């Protein structure tokens, strides 16, 4: 196990190099259904509760990093504690040490929380503020003596759901509240003692989203050299994330496409000595495994070729043709629906 070997002397470029390809636990402890669910949460989704095996799985197949997205709301209390249910907090816990006991990195974060109270708006911005700091108090507290394979991630996707920026990048107000939420994260993080002075952290984009706008308007916490920037890129859009539309990937002008976004970010970040995790990348099943695996090779190959690692989504939902069907694991069988693309990932990352 890594989960008490401390806080090396390292640089979040070095360490995100060792990162290297990371499998994220998907549409599990992210999952949602009502206030009343509790505990029934993690398996609402379809996937069967998380066993140590299942990581074992992923530990084998050659993956370095699991990312274990948490869905908090619903299991917080009211205003102004927010208090976390103790038995939400100690199964995320029982998850991590399946990660860290297979000697990997892991990833915790805050998910889904902008449907409900993550809204990036000035007028809202006290209440939001409030509430990640009682959220990431509680949280780090909880895991303040892991060592530096745990990783926070402050947190998901923050963007006004439905709103008109949601999906360019933001308003500049949205930016500048985000800003502030990820500011009030760190600053909370750091105070709560154990290692978590050291610990390194993530923080995202506008909706993790690597547009221009978006990462120019990105402030680290008083530029903090053990912050990571993180970005969901399901590049290119149709390809990855669309049903009954664009199959096939793999001519110059894709590839090209593909290494131009990965040199923006390249030049944006890393050329400028600041980490990116891409900690949410894939496609979806449409019959298409040739152009599935062409696809995860390259990503995988010209990421780690700018020290860039790079996550598959996997949330266990399987379904050619159809819509988010992202699984590479059957966690019943404990074998992968598709051993070929999870080789390209493994080949590409080195």
Not at 235 to 264: C, H, I, Q, R
Not at 310 to 320: L, Q
């Amino acid at each position: 196990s890594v989960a008490k070997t401390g806080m090396r002397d390292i640089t979040a470029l070095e360490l995100t190099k060792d990162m290297r390809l990371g499998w994220s636990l998907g549409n599990t402890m992210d999952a949602y259904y009502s206030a009343a669910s509790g505990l029934a949460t993690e398996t609402c989704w379809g996937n069967p509760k998380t066993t140590k095996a299942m990581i074992d799985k992923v530990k084998e197949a050659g993956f370095n990093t699991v990312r274990i997205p948490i869905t908090w709301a619903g299991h917080f209390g009211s205003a102004p504690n927010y208090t976390i249910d103790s038995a939400w907090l100690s199964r995320v816990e029982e998850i991590v040490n399946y990660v860290l006991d297979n000697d990997m990195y892991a990833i915790i974060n805050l998910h889904h929380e902008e449907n409900t109270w993550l809204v990036p708006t000035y007028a809202n911005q006290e209440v939001a503020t409030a509430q990640i700091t009682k959220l990431w108090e509680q949280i780090a507290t909880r895991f303040k003596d892991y060592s530096d394979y745990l990783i926070f991630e402050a947190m998901n996707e923050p963007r006004v759901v439905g709103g008109s920026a949601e999906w360019t990048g933001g308003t500049a107000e949205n930016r500048a509240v985000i800003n502030s939420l990820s500011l009030a994260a760190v600053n909370t993080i750091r105070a709560t003692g154990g290692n978590n002075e050291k610990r390194f952290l993530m923080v995202p984009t506008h909706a993790a989203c690597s547009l221009t706008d978006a990462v120019n308007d990105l402030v680290i916490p008083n530029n903090d050299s053990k912050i990571i920037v993180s970005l969901h890129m399901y590049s290119p859009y149709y390809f990855a994330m669309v049903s009954n539309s664009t199959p096939t990937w793999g001519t110059d002008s894709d590839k090209s496409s593909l290494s131009y976004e990965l040199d923006a970010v390249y030049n944006k970040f890393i050329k400028n000595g600041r980490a990116v995790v891409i900690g949410e990348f894939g496609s979806i099943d449409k019959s298409n495994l040739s152009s599935r695996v062409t696809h995860a090779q390259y990503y995988a190959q010209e990421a780690t070729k700018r020290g860039i690692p790079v996550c598959w989504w996997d949330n266990g939902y399987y379904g050619p043709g159809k819509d988010n069907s992202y699984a590479l694991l059957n966690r019943s069988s404990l074998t992968w629906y598709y051993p070929e693309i999870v080789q390209a990932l493994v080949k590409g990352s080195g």
